[PDB]
């Protein structure tokens, strides 16, 4: 009665296709004390305002069926 | 007769960035209050960390295997 199957989503594609490829490892570092009310940081490597999110993730998610979204650092209520 | 080999391919974009994390969530967003961070936090931007949303160094393997150049976000 039991039936088994699997969907394989593994790939070896680069995550970052185009951003600052002359940098061998892209790291950003910010001080909390110099942030505004909210900073929305990109985790999809498609934003035209990288390291900030510009909503590019939605196009990627729609295309590939992915579910990636940004990291938000904000001021508490 | 050029010495070049040309490859012309044609297919839809199927490569997900996130392979395994919280797949029942249609869009993964994390939001933290800056006041409640410690002295430092390091956030994964490669979706490979075993401690996502935190960077555990998994990006090194990804970059070596794929030729990529991704790394984390540090808030301090
Ligand atoms: S544009 Fe990349 S996470 Fe929004
Ligand atoms: S483990 Fe993903 S950016 Fe470090």
Nearest-CA neighbor of A58 among A42, A73, A34, A72? A42
Angle at A72 between CA A56 and CA A63, to 5 degrees: 25
Instruction: Write down the residue that tokens 């935190």 correspond to.
Output: B54
Output the six-digit token pair for B40: 């430092």
Q: Which atom of ligand 2 is nearest to the CA of B70?
A: 3
**Chain A residues touching residue B18 (CB < 8 angstroms):** 66-68
d(C-alpha B69, C-alpha A18), whole Å: 10
Q: Which of B27, B40, B50, B76 does the annotation list as catalytic?
A: B27
Handedness of CA B26, A57, B73, A76 (dihedral sign): negative
In contact, B52 and B20? CB cutoff 8 Å = no
d(C-alpha B18, C-alpha B30), whole Å: 15
Residue to mutate, A55, A61, A71, ligand 1, most ligand atoms under 8 Å from C-beta:
A55
d(C-alpha B44, C-alpha A43), whole Å: 8
Nearest-CA neighbor of A19 among A49, A39, A40? A49
Tell me if chain B has a CB within 8 Å of the CB of A24: yes
DSSP B9-71: --------S-SSTTTTSSSEEEEEEGGGS-S-EEE-SSS--TTTTB--STHHHHHHHH---EE
Query: From which experimental method does this structure derive?
Result: X-ray
Helices and strands counted in chain A (H then E): 1, 3
Asked if B69 and A16 come within 8 Å (Cβ–Cβ), the reply is yes
- In angstroms, the Cα distances linking B37 to A57, B28, B43, B70, B73 are 26, 20, 12, 23, 14
Cβ of A70 less than 6 Å from ligand 1: yes
Residue among A73, A74, A77 with most chain B CBs within 10 A, to mutate: A73
Beta strands in A1-77 (DSSP E): 26-30, 38-41, 68-74
Angle at B64 between CA B56 and CA A10, to 5 degrees: 80
Counted domains in chain A: 1
Other C-beta atoms lying within 10 Å of the C-beta of residue A29: 12
A38-41 sheet: strands from edge to edge: A38-41, A68-74, B28-33
Per the structure, the complete domain to which residue B44 belongs is given by 1-76
Which helix (H) or strand (E) is A52 found in, with range?
A: none
């Amino acid at each position: 009665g039991m039936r088994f199957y699997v969907k394989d989503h593994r790939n070896k594609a680069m995550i970052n296709l185009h951003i600052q490829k002359d940098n061998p490892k892209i790291v950003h570092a910010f001080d909390m004390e110099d942030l505004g009310d909210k900073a929305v940081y990109c985790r999809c490597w498609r934003s035209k305002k990288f390291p900030f999110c510009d909503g590019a993730h939605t196009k990627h998610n729609e295309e590939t069926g992915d579910n990636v979204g940004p990291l938000i650092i904000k001021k508490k209520e």
